[PDB]
Amino acid sequence: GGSVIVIDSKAAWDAQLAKGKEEHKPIVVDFTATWCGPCKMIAPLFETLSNDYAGKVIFLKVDVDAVAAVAEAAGITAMPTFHVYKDGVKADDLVGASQDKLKALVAKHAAA
């Protein structure tokens, strides 16, 4: 259930996590924020992968600016911070923009 949308609430994160049918697929969350300039570009960049890897891969663009609690609990610091909760648990991570590495991880965890 590729919820390839942007979100700003813990409740909606939970909802998506569930309806996403996470069981066997990559929950790729981009914990990004508004104010952190580059973040605003990194989001639409990742949106490309979101569009492409539809249905299976869940691209959660989480607005850390809003969902501060989940972000700090998850362990976000240097936003944007990408985590891959494949199946239903943080299987891999990637900090910063790091587009190539992000692409590589999405590909890796998607083709699995």
CB of 7 closer than 8 Å to CB of 43: no
Top CATH class of 1-112 equals alpha beta
Residue 72 CA, distance from chain mean position: 15
Q: What is the DSSP string of the chain?
A: ----SEE--HHHHHHHHHHTTGGGS-EEEEEE-SSSTTHHHHHHHHHHHHHHT-TTSEEEEEETTT-HHHHHHHT--SSSEEEE--TTS--EEEESS-HHHHHHHHHHHH--
Q: What is the DSSP string of 34-61?
A: SSSTTHHHHHHHHHHHHHHT-TTSEEEE
Q: Sign of torsion, CA 97 104 57 69?
A: negative
Mind telling me the catalytic residues? 36, 39
Cross-strand pairs, 94: 82
Report domain extents, the chain: 1-112
What was the structure determination method?
Answer: NMR
CB of 94 closer than 8 Å to CB of 29: no
